Amino acid sequence: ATYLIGDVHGCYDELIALLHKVEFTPGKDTLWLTGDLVARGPGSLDVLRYVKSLGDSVRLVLGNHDLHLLAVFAGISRNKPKDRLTPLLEAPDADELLNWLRRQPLLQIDEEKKLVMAHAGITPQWDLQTAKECARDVEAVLSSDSYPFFLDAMYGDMPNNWSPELRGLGRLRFITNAFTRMRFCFPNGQLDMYSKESPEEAPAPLKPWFAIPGPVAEEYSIAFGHWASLEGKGTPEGIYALDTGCCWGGTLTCLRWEDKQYFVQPSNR
Numbered sequence: 539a540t541y542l543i544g545d546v547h548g549c550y551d552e553l554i555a556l557l558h559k560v561e562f563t564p565g566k567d568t569l570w571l572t573g574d575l576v577a578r579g580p581g582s583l584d585v586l587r588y589v590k591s592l593g594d595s596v597r598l599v600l601g602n603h604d605l606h607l608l609a610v611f612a613g614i615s616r617n618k619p620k621d622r623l624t625p626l627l628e629a630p631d632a633d634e635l636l637n638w639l640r641r642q643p644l645l646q647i648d649e650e651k652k653l654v655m656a657h658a659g660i661t662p663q664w665d666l667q668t669a670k671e672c673a674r675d676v677e678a679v680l681s682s683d684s685y686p687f688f689l690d691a692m693y694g695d696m697p698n699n700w701s702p703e704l705r706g707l708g709r710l711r712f713i714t715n716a717f718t719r720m721r722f723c724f725p726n727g728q729l730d731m732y733s734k735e736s737p738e739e740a741p742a743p744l745k746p747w748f749a750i751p752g753p754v755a756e757e758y759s760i761a762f763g764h765w766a767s768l769e770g771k772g773t774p775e776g777i778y779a780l781d782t783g784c785c786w787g788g789t790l791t792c793l794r795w796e797d798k799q800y801f802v803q804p805s806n807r
């Protein structure tokens with residue numbers, strides 16, 4: 539069976555309880571994770587140890603808190619007490635876990651399932667070929683020896699409009715924001731980097747990225763996490779918002795692909 543779970547955010551106990559509920563069995567089953575494996579919850583260290591141990595039985599995409607963790611590790615960004623990352627950063631296997639983390643994809647595609655996964659979704663300004671090229675470009679910088687330079691360059695809210703003519707720092711920053719921070723779009727598909735509210739509470743003319751017809755979403759199902767205030771609700775057919783805010787006292791959600799059956803684990807917070 540194929541299981542898809544939203545943002546774990548260090549909620550190790552809930553993750554294991556949910557996987558036990560569905561009898562997740564490596565070798566028989568595959569797990570997809572929407573990223574943001576770490577921060578806020580208490581068990582980022584155990585989460586990374588477990589997910590890394592799953593090997594080919596897990597298909598992960600990186601989220602914005604995963605990238606921030608890598609930025610802290612690399613000395614680029616300051617550790618925020620509320621993220622609760624110190625046990626992981628101080629762990630003796632921190633290097634092994636974080637060097638594995640930075641080699642993971644931004645984008646997962648399964649053609650037989652016609653299924654796409656990224657942390658925040660697929661901007662309607664991208665077709666599938668472009669999304670693939672952009673993921674490959676940022677994965678290449680993240681997996682390279684020079685990744686701290688990229689991580690430093692990633693921060694920024696501009697440019698917020700895609701063009702194949704984008705070059706250099708602006709190009710990387712857009713790609714990063716689109717894959718890992720996107721929620722709302724302007725009518726022309728340009729990213730808004732400020733509103734984190736639910737679609738009903740957002741100011742006009744902002745609409746959810748998935749409310750704008752895009753070429754990927756017209757052909758593929760898209761699973762994503764990230765947007766907790768969406769509460770997994772309000773999406774079109776073929777769009778699966780899996781982040782139901784476990785670290786926030788919400789729930790951890792697991793979707794079984796074959797029958798589209800949902801399983802839920804209540805937060806322990």
Ligand SMILES: [Mn+2]
Pocket residue numbers: 574601602603657718763764765
């Ligand atoms: Mn996120």
Ligand SMILES: [Mn+2]
Pocket residue numbers: 545547574601603764765781
């Ligand atoms: Mn998140």
